[PDB]
Amino acid sequence: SSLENVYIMADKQKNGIKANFKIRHNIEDGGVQLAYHYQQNTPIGDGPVLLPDNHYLSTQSKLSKDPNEKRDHMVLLEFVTAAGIGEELFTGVVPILVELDGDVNGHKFSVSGEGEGDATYGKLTLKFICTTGKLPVPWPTLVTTLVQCFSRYPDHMKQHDFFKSAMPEGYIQERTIFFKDDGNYKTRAEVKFEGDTLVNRIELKGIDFKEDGNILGHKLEYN
Prior knowledge:
Elements: E1 2-11, E2 16-26, E3 32-43, E4 55-64, E5 73-83, E6 94-104, E7 107-118, E8 123-130, H1 162-165, E9 171-179, E10 184-194, E11 197-207
Parallel strand pairs: 6-11
Antiparallel strand pairs: 1-2, 1-4, 2-3, 3-9, 4-5, 5-8, 6-7, 7-8, 9-10, 10-11
């Protein structure tokens, strides 16, 4: 498993939030590949949202494989809890669909994911398939791109949950992810309800990657 803290701050000028954090990918030789994340979220609707005090999301991920699956894929379990120093839509189990189109150093690919979120327990369970064939980057590098409205906000912090407050209309989530000493991803996603289903539609563009670096060279552990 992995555990990372997403640091969130209000962005009042855009009626949204910003975030930053670092992901530590494990390299097959024992090293670490840092991926520095810079994030902004803006609401799709023109109504009020919850603009939070500074806080973090404590985010734990576990990656596995479906033993009966021969397509290139990732099974993902996550537990996420907000910590210090629209909500009615999330009181039960909510189906999730994720659809991503990407292009990294000219390698185009698509990913489709399905699963469910249970915000009461901060819990996500999803399975992702590369629908175009072989994924041209390591799965772990796409985890953060591939629905923070499923975070568990403790009752005493519920006034700081921007993500659910923007629902059902949703939000735009944008990132730049800088892979240390390597290339970057830029992502734009729309996260919103389609009926009773929470959908994450994403475009990802990756540039400046090293052909023999840890990403295009597939030198990251599957974790």
